[PDB]
Write a protein that binds this ligand. Sequence first.
Ligand SMILES: O=C(O)c1cc2ccccc2[nH]1
Ligand SMILES: Nc1nc(Cl)c2nc[nH]c2n1
Ligand SMILES: Nc1nc(Cl)c2nc[nH]c2n1
Lengths: 266, 269
Amino acid sequence: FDTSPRLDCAGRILTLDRPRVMGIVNVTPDSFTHTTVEAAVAHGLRLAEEGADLLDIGGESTAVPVEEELRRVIPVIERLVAQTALPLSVDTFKPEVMRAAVAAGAGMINDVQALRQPGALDAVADLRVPVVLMHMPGDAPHYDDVVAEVHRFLVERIFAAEMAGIDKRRLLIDPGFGFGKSTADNVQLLAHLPRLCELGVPVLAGLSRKRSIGELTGRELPEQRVAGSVAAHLLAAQRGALLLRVHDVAATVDALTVWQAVQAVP
Amino acid sequence: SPRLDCAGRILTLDRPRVMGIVNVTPDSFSDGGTHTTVEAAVAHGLRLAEEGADLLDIGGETRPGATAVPVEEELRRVIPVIERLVAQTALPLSVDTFKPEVMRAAVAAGAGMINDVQALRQPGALDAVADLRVPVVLMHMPAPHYDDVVAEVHRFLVERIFAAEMAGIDKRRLLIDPGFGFGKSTADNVQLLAHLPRLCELGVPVLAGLSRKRSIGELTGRELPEQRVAGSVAAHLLAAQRGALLLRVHDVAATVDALTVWQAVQAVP
Ligand SMILES: O=C(O)c1cc2ccccc2[nH]1
Ligand SMILES: Nc1nc(Cl)c2nc[nH]c2n1
Ligand SMILES: Nc1nc(Cl)c2nc[nH]c2n1
């Protein structure tokens, strides 16, 4: 990029002059929802304190009705927009959630379906907020060439978005690590990540605590995969990723900080 | 690929290997009320072996502007630890000492490598390593002013490799180390890490040790050594990418995980 990507997230600017950190804020009720909202807000505040550049708020596991997804994400977005100065992303594939979340203060859409849900293209075109287009087969299959297939899919979605009137400067792409991909397919996409960076749009990588990291390192549980995840995110940043979707914000910031100091030496 | 015979225990440097830090000092442990220093160091070395260390570095000489440890006290610390670890692990064991008497006693006790912060400059160290026929790490230590820290460290290591070869130490048994944090500012440490490939051109394996060091703390704003784990793991991965074949670390499991992810990625044609 001659000029670094400058994403206007509803007035909150995300500058991709260096790899940035997107902190994961999950609002899905589990075995342990008003208490869920309170816990998600406290978690988002902790990630902001840890140095996140953006928070990604999601109320659906990646099928809940739109009204239930709104009951989860809207109070979290309303509280975080008032209590942080950070750009906020909403992790949803539903156009009605995208519209309601942006009206509540979200400044970016993170869509696992890459605007394939009926009405999603029209909603994002109308909202004029940045959007992440992720690769997911349908909604782990065999690939003849996973890198070529993900590349082809992302070209199609970028084009579909541009033809719907979404400015190319508002797009981000993501290969979708862990979504219908074996450990070998994920490793291939990470090794060949510079090839996806040639589409003229910033690349987001999310390998945080994923099963493939667990398989490479022999770590069964998500919190046991932190070291391997921080390493994977550093490797992704070295290979062109400009946004990193992580649970372990402070650790990722530290790793990128050390790398930035080293990379700065002529 | 370098094949280091550490007194019968083979260390193959076909990929970066992890050297686990085993400090045998009372200040290294907080369980001294009911444990001995030796027993705590042995249990720690066993934990590092379980975490996947490729070798253990046992040292008895840890404090700001540290008081010199007398030889008899250094032996009292490292020898029982080496004797127990050689019997309870299959790993090559390094002794971190600059004293020839400790080098000889440690090798007789089961150590298979010498890690010398003084690069064999202590009188008798060249004769001990030549006699012992074990691998040896030659580290740089002079924070003083450098006109060119990279060129100065390179020049020192060429001089010490030459001194070791001239004393009869086989070049195949040598390792070099720029000595991160030893009389070096954060800027000097960053320069040496960024220019590490230049040191890898001396035909000898390179060891990098940046584990929980002050420079990592300065780069990340982490005051306490235990808060520097992520920055240290990142520094060690960067060193490995820049040619280091040995990594001297406290956080063995985390470093092994990082190198494992990198190995999988680097293996893609
Ligand atoms: O670790 C030590 O030196 C130490 C622990 C402890 C506990 C109770 C009394 C004395 C003690 N000393
Ligand atoms: N964009 C995005 N990327 C990844 Cl990997 C994800 N994993 C869960 N949600 C996600 N959203
Ligand atoms: N070889 C070696 N290298 C480093 Cl950085 C060290 N730091 C403490 N002891 C050490 N020994």
